[PDB]
């Protein structure tokens, strides 16, 4: 029961999402192997995701987390990257399929850095690249990220050297302990704690 509302480039809501999309690009330590080499995106379209059942699922779980955390859901707007955003905008997030392990264990991954989410669009470590050119840095094929509303509540703070929640926590925060430039990543283990608000269709742009 999902509806997609295409946003005009003139809409204030379109510009504030693209802005967040463009300004959260950062240099990547891996030399762009996973997500490709680029400094900015070409936004082809942004779509608002509306689904009543999914929203109720989210707000319901949000109320429970909030009451377990001094009335603080600790809600963020985070980017999500994976090759399943097509099923997700219809079926919503589902922790049952989130068994693939990452840097911070298994679970559903989000990031403040859009370019970090871009790394996982075509699979873990970029997979084998786009289905058509097998190029992880393809400048032609379309990519899709979700700009989601996520509930973090009491989040366990994990530091890196750069599946259920920890007892008494509703999520996990992944933070670099030396590179203060890389923004945080987040992992949740309840599909109900994330709602995909926006669908961003884009291409990475080849630097000049």
Ligand X SMILES: COc1ccc(-n2c(SCCCN3C(=O)c4cccc5cccc(c45)C3=O)nnc2-c2ccncc2)cc1
Site size toward ligand X (CB under 6 A) is 18
Q: Which two tokens stand for residue 48?
A: 């608002």
The Cβ of residue 72 has, within 10 Å, a number of other Cβ atoms equal to: 13
Give Cα 15 to chain centroid, integer Å. Answer: 18
Asked if 118 touches ligand X (CB under 6 A), the answer is no
Contact predicate 183/24, CB 8 Å: yes
The nearer residue to Zn ion, 37 or 100, going by C-beta atoms, is 37
Residue nearest to ligand X (CB): 102
Put residue 114 in one of left, alpha, beta given phi > 0 → left and psi -120 to 50 → alpha.
alpha
The nearer residue to Zn ion, 52 or 134, going by C-beta atoms, is 134
3-state SS string over 89-103? HHHCCCHHHCCCEEC
The nearer residue to ligand X, 7 or 78, going by C-beta atoms, is 78
Pick from 35, 36, 191, 196 the residue near ligand X by CB under 6 A. Answer: 191
- Of 35-43, 55-63, 120-128, 132-140, the window that binds ligand X (rule: CB under 6 A) is 120-128
Q: Using CB under 6 A as the criterion, which residues of the chain lie in contact with ligand X when the complex forms? A: 82-84, 87-88, 91, 93-94, 97-98, 100, 102, 108-109, 120, 123-124, 191
């Amino acid at each position: 029961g999902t509806i997609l509302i295409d946003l005009s480039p003139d809409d204030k809501e379109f510009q504030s999402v693209e802005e967040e999309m463009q300004s959260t690009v950062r240099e990547h330590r891996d030399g762009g192997h996973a997500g490709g080499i680029f400094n900015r995106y070409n936004i082809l379209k942004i779509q608002k995701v509306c689904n009543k059942k999914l929203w109720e699922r989210y707000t319901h779980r949000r109320k429970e987390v909030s009451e377990e955390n001094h009335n603080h859901a600790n809600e963020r707007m985070l980017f999500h990257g994976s090759p399943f955003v097509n099923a997700i905008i219809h079926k919503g997030f589902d922790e049952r399929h989130a068994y693939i392990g990452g840097m911070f264990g298994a679970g559903i991954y989000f990031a403040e850095n859009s370019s970090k989410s871009n790394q996982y669009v075509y699979g873990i470590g970029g997979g084998t690249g786009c289905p058509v050119h097998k190029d992880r840095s393809c400048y032609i094929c379309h990519r899709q990220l979700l700009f989601c509303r996520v509930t973090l509540g009491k989040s366990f703070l994990q530091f890196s050297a750069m599946a259920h929640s920890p007892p008494g926590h509703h999520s996990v925060t992944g933070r670099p302990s030396v590179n203060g430039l890389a923004l945080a990543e987040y992992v949740i283990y309840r599909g109900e704690q994330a709602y995909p608000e926006y669908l961003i269709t884009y291409q990475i742009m080849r630097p000049e």
